[PDB]
Design a protein around this ligand. Structure first.
Ligand SMILES: CC(=O)c1c(C)c2cnc(Nc3ccc(N4CCNCC4)cn3)nc2n(C2CCCC2)c1=O
Ligand SMILES: CC(=O)c1c(C)c2cnc(Nc3ccc(N4CCNCC4)cn3)nc2n(C2CCCC2)c1=O
Lengths: 302, 302
C-alpha cells in the first residue's frame, strides 16, 4: 500500500531476473559506467491490486553494481529475495531496511546520484584494490522510481549492524570542532542515535584488543584518505554496540554476513560486540582537514 | 538473432511472470475485455547480447487470455516454457511453431487485432458454453511488438497437429465453388499443404467410425453456426493425416495434448490418425451461405 515501495520491489525483481540472463564477465568496460536500463509500464484496467497503473523504473550501471555485489560476497538471488520476498520496513517518523535487516534503502537526491556517478569508477577500483575489505559504504544498487508524477532516487547498501544481533546503543561520530549532541525527541524513541558528545560524555569505551584496533585503523586510514582524495566530507563513523547479556550461537556472529563486527577483548567489563563502518559520504573546514581530524577522534576513543 | 522473435520470448516471459502474482478470479469483468499491459524498455549501453536496446511490448486483455488458457487445459508455466526455453522455429520461405510443436505463432494485421477484440467477449462465452470442447482456433495470447520502428502483431494458438506424431499429408478445405488447388512450388517442399481439389481428386478418404463422425459434425455445426452468427467467413478445415506405419505409445496419442486427434476405425486400409480443426477465422458469397456450404463439403468427405 506504499506505491513507491512496491515499484522498488518490482524493479529489483525485474533487475535481477534480467541480469540472470546476462553473462557475467570478469571485467567491466568503461561503457558499463555510463550505462542504464529504463522500463516504462502502462497497465490499462489490469493488475490494479499489486502495481500502480503507470510507473517508470530506472537502474544505473547495472553491470557495475552486480560486480560490486559479487565483490562484497552477495549473491543476486539472495539480494533479490531480501528485497522482494516481503516488503522493506520504514524506520523513522528517513530510510528502509530489508525485512531480513540485511540491506539499507535510502532515498537520495539527484545531486547524490550525480555525485555517485561521478565517483563510481574510482570507487569500483578502490574496492578492487582492497579486495572488498573496507569500512566504506557498500553500494549495491542505485535506482530511479516514477509513480505518476512523483520521482525518487534510491541507493541500496549493506547494513552496518547485524541482521541477527540487536544493538542497544548507536553512535554517529564525525570528530568535529562544533558541538554535536542528540535530540530528546530522539532519546525518547526506543532506539536513539547518539552523536559525538553523548559519547564523549557518559564515559563510553570500546574494548577491542590491540590487533583488532591496529587492523581497524589501518583500514580506516586508507578509506578516509580515499574519501579525502575525492574531495568528500561530512561522513560519520556509525558505531553500534550489542550487549550479549541482554539479548545459531549464544553470542557469536557470522563474520561473513555481519562484516563489520568485532568481538570485545577478554577483560571487557561486559560481553560486547561492536559494529563500526563509515556512512553518508556523498556530500561534496576542508576535505583534507576533515579526514585527519576524523582520524584523530576515532583513534582517541578506541 | 531475430530481434522480433526475442522480444516475443521476452514478452511472454514477462507476461506470465506478472500474472503469477495476480490472483486468478473465477469470473472475468467487462473491463478485462478492454484491458492491456504496455512495457517500454530502453537499454543504454547494456544487455546488447540478448535484447535490442529499444523495444515496446503490449499484451491485450491478459486476464481473458489466461482464462482461455486455463479453459483449454494449458498451464501458464508450461505455456511460458514452450515459448521461452528455446526459440520458436520459422515455417516457410508465414508463421512459427514453438520448439516443442505445441503452439502456433502467427503474425496478424492491425485489422485482425481489431476483429479479435471485436469478437473476444462472444468468443469467450462460447468457449464457456461448450466447456472448451470445440474445433475453433484456441486463442491463447495476443501481442504487439515494437523493435526500433518496426511494429508487428502476433496471435498464439494451439497447433491442430500433434506435437509428437508427424503428419505426412495436410489439407485445407473450404468447400468453395471456385477451384482450389496446390502450387507445384508448394508440392516440392518436404511437407506441402494441399487444398480442396487435391483431396477431391486422388481419392482421399477419412476412415473414422460412425460415433466419431457424429460427434465431430455435431461440434462442427455448432462451431460453424457461431462463426456465421459473427458474420465471419473464409475459414478452412485443416486436415492432417498421420501414417502410423511409416513413423510413449507405438501409434497412440495423448488425447489431452493432441486434442484434435481421432483414431481411424478397425477396418481402415492403413493405420491412420486424423487431426482436424477450424483455422483462419478473422476475415470479415455471404457468411450465412458459406457456413452451410462448408458443412455440406465436410459431410460428403467423412
Ligand atoms: C548510505 C549510507 O552511507 C548508509 C549506510 C551504509 C548505512 C548502513 N547501515 C545502517 N544501519 C542502521 C542505521 C541506523 C539505525 N537506527 C535504528 C533505529 N532508528 C535510529 C537508527 C539502524 N540501522 N544505516 C546506514 N545509513 C543510515 C544512516 C543515515 C540514514 C540511513 C546510511 O546512510
Ligand atoms: C490462427 C489459426 O487459425 C491457425 C491455427 C489455429 C493453426 C493451428 N495449427 C497449425 N499447424 C500447422 C499448420 C501447417 C503446417 N505446415 C507444416 C509445413 N508447412 C506447410 C504446413 C504445420 N502446422 N496451423 C495453424 N495456422 C496456420 C495456417 C495458416 C498459417 C498458420 C493458423 O492460422
Amino acid at each position: 500500500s506504499d506505491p513507491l515501495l512496491s515499484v522498488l520491489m518490482w524493479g529489483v525483481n525485474h533487475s535481477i531476473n534480467e541480469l540472470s540472463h546476462v553473462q557475467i564477465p570478469v571485467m567491466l568496460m568503461p561503457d558499463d559506467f555510463k550505462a542504464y536500463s529504463k522500463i516504462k509500464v502502462d497497465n490499462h484496467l489490469f493488475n490494479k491490486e499489486n502495481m500502480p497503473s503507470h510507473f517508470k523504473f530506472k537502474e544505473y550501471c547495472p553491470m557495475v553494481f552486480r560486480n560490486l555485489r559479487e565483490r562484497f560476497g552477495i549473491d543476486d538471488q539472495d539480494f533479490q529475495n531480501s528485497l522482494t520476498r516481503s516488503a522493506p520496513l520504514p524506520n523513522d517518523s528517513r530510510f528502509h531496511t530489508s525485512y531480513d535487516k540485511r540491506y539499507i534503502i535510502k532515498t537520495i537526491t539527484s545531486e547524490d546520484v550525480a555525485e555517485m556517478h561521478n565517483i563510481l569508477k574510482k570507487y569500483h577500483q578502490y574496492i578492487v584494490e582492497c579486495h572488498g575489505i573496507t569500512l566504506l559504504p557498500q553500494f549495491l544498487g542505485m535506482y530511479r522510481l516514477n509513480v505518476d508524477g512523483v520521482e525518487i532516487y534510491v541507493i541500496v547498501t549493506r547494513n552496518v549492524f547485524s541482521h541477527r544481533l540487536s544493538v542497544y546503543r548507536k553512535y554517529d561520530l564525525k570528530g568535529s570542532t562544533v558541538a554535536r549532541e542528540a535530540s530528546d525527541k530522539e532519546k525518547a524513541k526506543e532506539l536513539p542515535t547518539l552523536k559525538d558528545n553523548d559519547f564523549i560524555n557518559e564515559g563510553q569505551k570500546i574494548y577491542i584488543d590491540d590487533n583488532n584496533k591496529k587492523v581497524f585503523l589501518e583500514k580506516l586510514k586508507k578509506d578516509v584518505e580515499f574519501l579525502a582524495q575525492l574531495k568528500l566530507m561530512d561522513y560519520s563513523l556509525l558505531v553500534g554496540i550489542h550487549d550479549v547479556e541482554r539479548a545459531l550461537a549464544p553470542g557469536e556472529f557470522d563474520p561473513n554476513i555481519d562484516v563489520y563486527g568485532i568481538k570485545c577483548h577478554e577483560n571487557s567489563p561486559r560481553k560486547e560486540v561492536y559494529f563500526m563502518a563509515i556512512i553518508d559520504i556523498l556530500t561534496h573546514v576542508n576535505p583534507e582537514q576533515y579526514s585527519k581530524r576524523f582520524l584523530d577522534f576515532i583513534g582517541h576513543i578506541l
